[PDB]
Coordinates of C-alpha atoms in Angstrom, one line a residue:
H1 CA 1.7 -3.4 -0.9
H2 CA 0.0 0.0 0.0
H3 CA 2.9 2.5 0.5
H4 CA 4.0 2.3 -3.3
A5 CA 0.3 3.1 -4.3
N6 CA 0.2 6.1 -1.9
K7 CA 3.5 7.6 -3.3
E8 CA 2.3 7.1 -6.9
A9 CA -1.1 8.8 -6.3
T10 CA 0.7 11.7 -4.4
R11 CA 3.2 12.3 -7.3
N12 CA 0.3 12.3 -9.8
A13 CA -2.1 14.5 -7.8
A14 CA 0.8 16.9 -7.1
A15 CA 1.7 17.0 -10.9
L16 CA -2.0 17.6 -12.0
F17 CA -3.2 20.1 -9.4
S18 CA 0.2 21.8 -10.1
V19 CA -1.1 23.3 -13.4
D20 CA -3.1 26.0 -11.6
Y21 CA 0.2 27.3 -10.1
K22 CA 1.5 27.7 -13.7
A23 CA -1.8 29.2 -14.7
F24 CA -1.0 31.9 -12.1
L25 CA 2.7 32.3 -12.9
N26 CA 1.9 32.9 -16.6
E27 CA 0.1 36.1 -15.6
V28 CA 3.1 37.5 -13.8
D29 CA 4.4 40.4 -15.8
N30 CA 6.9 43.2 -15.3
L31 CA 6.7 46.8 -16.5
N32 CA 8.8 46.4 -19.5
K33 CA 7.3 43.1 -20.5
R34 CA 3.9 44.6 -20.4
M35 CA 4.1 48.2 -21.5
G36 CA 7.5 48.6 -23.0
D37 CA 9.6 51.6 -22.3
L38 CA 7.5 54.5 -21.0
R39 CA 10.3 57.0 -20.4
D40 CA 10.1 60.4 -22.1
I41 CA 6.7 60.1 -23.9
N42 CA 5.1 63.3 -25.1
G43 CA 1.5 62.1 -25.7
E44 CA -1.1 62.3 -23.0
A45 CA -2.9 59.1 -24.0
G46 CA -1.9 55.7 -25.3
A47 CA -3.1 52.4 -26.6
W48 CA -0.9 49.2 -26.6
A49 CA -0.8 45.6 -27.4
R50 CA 1.3 42.7 -26.4
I51 CA 1.8 39.0 -27.2
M52 CA 3.8 36.5 -25.3
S53 CA 4.4 32.9 -26.4
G54 CA 6.4 30.2 -24.6
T55 CA 7.1 26.8 -23.1
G56 CA 8.3 25.4 -19.7
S57 CA 8.9 22.1 -18.0
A58 CA 9.2 20.3 -14.7
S59 CA 9.8 16.6 -13.7
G60 CA 7.2 13.8 -14.3
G61 CA 7.4 14.9 -18.0
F62 CA 5.5 18.1 -17.3
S63 CA 5.8 20.6 -20.2
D64 CA 3.5 23.4 -21.1
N65 CA 3.3 26.2 -23.7
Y66 CA 1.0 29.2 -23.7
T67 CA 0.0 32.2 -25.8
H68 CA -0.8 35.4 -23.9
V69 CA -2.5 38.3 -25.6
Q70 CA -3.1 41.6 -23.9
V71 CA -4.2 45.1 -24.8
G72 CA -4.7 48.3 -22.9
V73 CA -5.3 52.0 -22.9
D74 CA -4.2 54.8 -20.6
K75 CA -4.0 58.5 -19.8
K76 CA -0.6 60.0 -19.0
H77 CA -0.7 62.8 -16.4
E78 CA 2.2 65.2 -16.6
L79 CA 3.4 66.2 -13.2
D80 CA 6.7 67.9 -11.9
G81 CA 9.4 65.3 -12.9
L82 CA 6.9 62.5 -13.1
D83 CA 4.7 61.0 -15.8
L84 CA 1.9 58.9 -14.3
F85 CA 0.2 56.4 -16.7
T86 CA -3.2 55.3 -15.4
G87 CA -5.2 52.8 -17.4
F88 CA -7.2 49.6 -18.0
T89 CA -6.1 46.3 -19.5
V90 CA -7.7 43.1 -20.8
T91 CA -5.9 39.8 -21.4
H92 CA -6.4 36.4 -23.0
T93 CA -4.3 33.2 -22.5
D94 CA -4.5 29.8 -24.1
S95 CA -2.2 27.2 -22.6
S96 CA -1.7 23.5 -22.9
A97 CA -0.1 21.2 -20.5
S98 CA 0.9 17.6 -20.2
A99 CA 2.7 15.1 -18.1
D100 CA 3.1 11.3 -17.8
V101 CA -0.5 10.7 -16.5
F102 CA -2.4 13.6 -18.0
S103 CA -2.8 16.3 -20.6
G104 CA -5.2 19.2 -21.4
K105 CA -6.0 22.9 -22.0
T106 CA -6.7 26.1 -20.1
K107 CA -8.4 29.3 -21.6
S108 CA -8.1 32.5 -19.6
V109 CA -9.7 35.9 -19.7
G110 CA -8.7 38.8 -17.5
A111 CA -9.1 42.5 -16.8
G112 CA -7.2 45.0 -14.6
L113 CA -6.0 48.5 -13.9
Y114 CA -2.5 49.9 -13.5
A115 CA -0.6 53.0 -12.5
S116 CA 2.9 53.4 -13.7
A117 CA 5.1 56.2 -12.4
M118 CA 8.1 57.2 -14.4
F119 CA 10.3 59.7 -12.6
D120 CA 12.7 62.1 -14.2
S121 CA 15.4 60.9 -11.7
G122 CA 15.4 57.3 -13.3
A123 CA 13.1 55.8 -10.5
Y124 CA 10.0 54.0 -11.5
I125 CA 7.0 52.4 -9.7
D126 CA 4.4 50.0 -11.3
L127 CA 1.2 49.0 -9.6
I128 CA -1.3 46.5 -11.2
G129 CA -4.4 44.8 -9.9
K130 CA -6.2 42.2 -12.0
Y131 CA -8.8 39.4 -12.2
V132 CA -8.4 36.3 -14.3
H133 CA -11.0 33.6 -15.0
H134 CA -9.7 30.2 -16.1
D135 CA -11.6 27.4 -17.8
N136 CA -9.7 24.2 -17.5
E137 CA -10.1 20.8 -19.3
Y138 CA -7.7 18.0 -18.3
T139 CA -7.9 14.2 -19.0
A140 CA -6.1 11.7 -16.7
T141 CA -5.0 8.3 -17.7
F142 CA -5.0 7.2 -14.0
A143 CA -7.4 5.9 -11.3
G144 CA -10.3 6.3 -13.8
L145 CA -10.5 10.0 -13.3
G146 CA -11.4 10.5 -16.9
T147 CA -11.9 13.9 -18.5
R148 CA -12.6 16.9 -16.1
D149 CA -13.7 20.4 -16.9
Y150 CA -13.5 23.0 -14.1
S151 CA -13.3 26.8 -13.5
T152 CA -10.9 28.7 -11.3
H153 CA -10.2 32.4 -10.9
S154 CA -7.3 34.6 -9.7
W155 CA -6.8 37.9 -8.1
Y156 CA -3.5 39.5 -8.6
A157 CA -1.9 42.5 -6.9
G158 CA 1.6 43.4 -7.9
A159 CA 4.1 46.2 -7.0
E160 CA 7.4 46.9 -8.8
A161 CA 10.1 49.4 -8.1
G162 CA 13.4 50.1 -9.9
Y163 CA 16.1 52.7 -10.5
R164 CA 17.8 53.4 -13.8
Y165 CA 21.3 54.7 -13.2
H166 CA 22.9 56.2 -16.3
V167 CA 26.6 55.0 -16.3
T168 CA 27.2 57.0 -19.5
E169 CA 25.2 59.4 -21.8
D170 CA 24.0 56.2 -23.5
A171 CA 24.6 53.1 -21.2
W172 CA 22.6 52.2 -18.0
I173 CA 22.2 49.7 -15.1
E174 CA 18.7 49.2 -13.5
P175 CA 18.2 47.2 -10.3
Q176 CA 14.5 46.1 -9.8
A177 CA 12.3 44.5 -7.2
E178 CA 8.9 43.2 -7.5
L179 CA 6.3 41.6 -5.2
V180 CA 3.1 39.9 -6.5
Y181 CA 0.3 38.8 -4.2
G182 CA -2.4 36.5 -5.4
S183 CA -5.6 34.7 -4.4
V184 CA -6.2 31.6 -6.5
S185 CA -9.2 29.2 -5.9
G186 CA -9.5 25.6 -5.1
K187 CA -11.3 22.8 -6.9
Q188 CA -12.9 19.4 -5.7
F189 CA -13.3 16.1 -7.7
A190 CA -15.3 13.1 -6.3
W191 CA -15.4 9.9 -8.4
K192 CA -15.7 6.1 -8.5
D193 CA -13.0 3.7 -9.8
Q194 CA -13.3 -0.1 -9.1
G195 CA -16.5 0.5 -7.1
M196 CA -14.7 2.8 -4.5
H197 CA -15.4 6.5 -3.8
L198 CA -12.2 8.6 -4.2
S199 CA -11.8 12.3 -4.0
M200 CA -9.3 15.1 -4.6
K201 CA -9.8 18.5 -3.0
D202 CA -7.4 21.5 -3.0
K203 CA -8.0 24.6 -0.9
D204 CA -8.1 28.2 -1.9
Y205 CA -4.5 29.5 -1.8
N206 CA -2.5 32.6 -1.8
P207 CA 0.8 32.9 -3.8
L208 CA 3.4 35.5 -2.9
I209 CA 6.0 35.7 -5.6
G210 CA 9.1 37.9 -5.3
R211 CA 11.7 39.0 -7.8
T212 CA 14.9 40.9 -7.6
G213 CA 17.1 41.6 -10.6
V214 CA 19.3 44.0 -12.6
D215 CA 18.8 45.0 -16.2
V216 CA 21.5 46.7 -18.3
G217 CA 21.2 48.7 -21.6
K218 CA 22.9 50.5 -24.4
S219 CA 21.0 52.9 -26.6
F220 CA 21.6 54.4 -30.1
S221 CA 19.8 57.4 -31.5
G222 CA 19.0 59.6 -34.4
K223 CA 16.8 62.7 -34.7
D224 CA 13.7 60.5 -35.3
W225 CA 14.5 57.0 -33.8
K226 CA 16.1 55.2 -30.9
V227 CA 17.0 51.5 -30.3
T228 CA 18.2 50.1 -26.9
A229 CA 19.9 46.7 -26.6
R230 CA 19.0 45.3 -23.2
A231 CA 19.8 42.2 -21.1
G232 CA 18.6 41.2 -17.6
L233 CA 19.5 38.8 -14.8
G234 CA 17.0 38.1 -12.0
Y235 CA 16.0 35.8 -9.2
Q236 CA 12.3 34.9 -8.9
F237 CA 11.0 33.1 -5.7
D238 CA 7.9 31.9 -3.8
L239 CA 7.8 33.4 -0.3
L240 CA 4.7 31.2 0.5
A241 CA 3.2 27.9 -0.4
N242 CA 0.0 27.6 1.5
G243 CA -1.6 25.1 -0.9
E244 CA -2.8 21.7 0.3
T245 CA -4.3 18.8 -1.7
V246 CA -6.2 16.2 0.3
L247 CA -6.8 12.8 -1.2
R248 CA -9.6 10.7 0.5
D249 CA -10.2 7.0 -0.1
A250 CA -11.8 3.9 1.4
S251 CA -8.8 3.4 3.7
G252 CA -8.2 7.1 4.6
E253 CA -7.1 10.7 4.1
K254 CA -3.6 11.9 2.9
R255 CA -2.4 15.6 2.9
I256 CA 0.2 17.0 0.6
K257 CA 1.3 20.6 1.4
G258 CA 2.5 23.1 -1.2
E259 CA 6.2 23.4 -1.8
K260 CA 8.1 26.7 -2.6
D261 CA 10.0 27.0 -5.9
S262 CA 12.5 29.6 -7.1
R263 CA 14.5 30.0 -10.4
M264 CA 17.0 32.4 -12.1
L265 CA 15.5 34.5 -14.9
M266 CA 17.5 35.5 -18.0
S267 CA 16.4 37.8 -20.9
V268 CA 17.7 39.7 -23.9
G269 CA 15.9 42.3 -25.9
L270 CA 15.5 45.6 -27.6
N271 CA 13.2 48.6 -27.2
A272 CA 12.6 50.8 -30.3
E273 CA 11.2 54.3 -30.9
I274 CA 10.1 55.4 -34.4
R275 CA 9.2 59.1 -34.9
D276 CA 6.9 60.6 -32.1
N277 CA 4.1 58.0 -31.6
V278 CA 5.3 54.3 -32.1
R279 CA 7.3 52.2 -29.6
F280 CA 8.1 48.5 -29.9
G281 CA 9.6 46.1 -27.3
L282 CA 10.8 42.5 -27.9
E283 CA 12.4 40.0 -25.6
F284 CA 13.7 36.5 -25.5
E285 CA 13.7 34.9 -22.0
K286 CA 14.2 31.7 -20.1
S287 CA 14.9 30.3 -16.6
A288 CA 17.3 28.0 -14.9
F289 CA 17.4 25.9 -11.6
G290 CA 13.7 25.7 -10.7
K291 CA 11.6 22.6 -10.3
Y292 CA 9.7 24.5 -13.0
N293 CA 11.6 26.5 -15.7
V294 CA 10.7 28.6 -18.7
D295 CA 12.7 26.7 -21.3
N296 CA 12.1 29.3 -24.0
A297 CA 9.7 32.3 -24.5
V298 CA 9.4 35.6 -26.5
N299 CA 7.4 38.7 -25.7
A300 CA 6.5 41.7 -28.0
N301 CA 4.8 44.8 -27.2
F302 CA 3.7 47.8 -29.3
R303 CA 2.6 51.2 -28.0
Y304 CA 1.0 54.0 -30.0
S305 CA 1.1 57.3 -27.9
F306 CA -0.8 60.4 -28.9

């Protein structure tokens, strides 16, 4: 036998109810990934779009890949040494996920509000609050669980601060720090295999994800364009794992607590300006050392300011 059975069901339940943690981690952004470069914009209003695509993996043969699409609009308030962008955003994500004992899909829709403060000194603050609804469909080739469709939703509150120090007229270093608090929801399956009631119930939980990093950049200019080459190194970490899956069965109840994960983040990219209205961001990024890693992903954003 019974101990081998219990370890197998724990590994598989952990893997499967894991996907909601990646459904939350996919929505974690940073200012530059979301909005692009917001420094020194003349227009008092803006509209922007973004697409991210990517893939990640963990043990048990877990790999996923997702496409995130996001748009927003804002007003920029011009204050003394401070541009404050206040706006709304809507998002859509399609992801797919698999592992040794399951596979399926997740569709997400979200909406939020942000404030981004760009200070003449080089300092920045980014604040965002959002809601994401997730429709999930996963099939398990294990304990006769079959196909299951379920909903979950997520609240997200994130705060980011950073300081761009200009090492030369055209080169810069930028330490950053970010904290993202969330409020993801539990699900419950009850079912019969071999004439025996089984069940799998996870509780509402609350991720806290921290990030600290440095970005570096080098810019090139003409009268009507700029391009900045940038690269970044960071450390991303759970500060909390308050999840708990409970598996119930004829014989008894077994509890499996959340585990923290952390990884090193790496990125390279460019930000472009063309004439007075158009900006464009692009980055390639991945992660090392986590139980879960982004193996490869790319993000593009486009801002039209007026």
